[PDB]
Amino acid sequence: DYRVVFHIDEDDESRVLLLISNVRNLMADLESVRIEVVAYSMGVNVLRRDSEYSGDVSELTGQGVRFCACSNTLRASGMDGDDLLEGVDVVSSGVGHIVRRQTEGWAYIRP
Template sequence: MIRTVFLLLLLNVFSYADTIFAEPAPSIMEPRQIIFSINRGDDETIHHVLSSANNVLKYYGPEKVHMRIVAYYHGLRALLKKEKDIAVRIDALQQYDVEFVACENTMKTKQIKKEELIDDVEIVTAGIVEITERVKEGWIYIVP
């Protein structure tokens, strides 16, 4: 009986081990470079990406992460000022230096003007090319 309890306790301890950082460990000088995309316009998808980004920031610490979130196709909805509940979450992430990027091709297709976007959103010609180039530079692309 005591042996069984001991084994269960030991198993429980090992099942909650912390993640071991790959080298070099994230630091202010060498932050993790992470890119997310939002390409669907439904609330669940948008909030899931924003929550995932927030979780990454909480785990590493905002000073150890350089993060970009690229919105294109229907996901561009996330960067519109008129989407108040989403805009509040984006503003909070921007306070931690998360960069938000809008696809100009999508803006043209959907006839969205720069003035309709949340403040401090960067516009790039093609969102998918932005992701491709960052991955080529060694950024980690996360698709929640």
């Protein structure tokens, strides 16, 4: 049924909690939905193992939500896959993945 990819590139608290809230809201309002969360730039800090949002990220991952980190930004930010929480996947490009997804018919949400 529904397919949607979220986009977050900041790590300020209110924006992060809004994304989280939007992801949960969406899973409850739509019968069937596939969700991906693409985070790049400062936004990747949310996917770090030492992140204050790790509980939220690990829990949603268990519910089928796929979090994607940008292969490029990572380097740019002195980060590698070892710094990311378990369950978080890496895509070659945050924006590229978003464009591919949109091109494949996925809906786009930028909280």
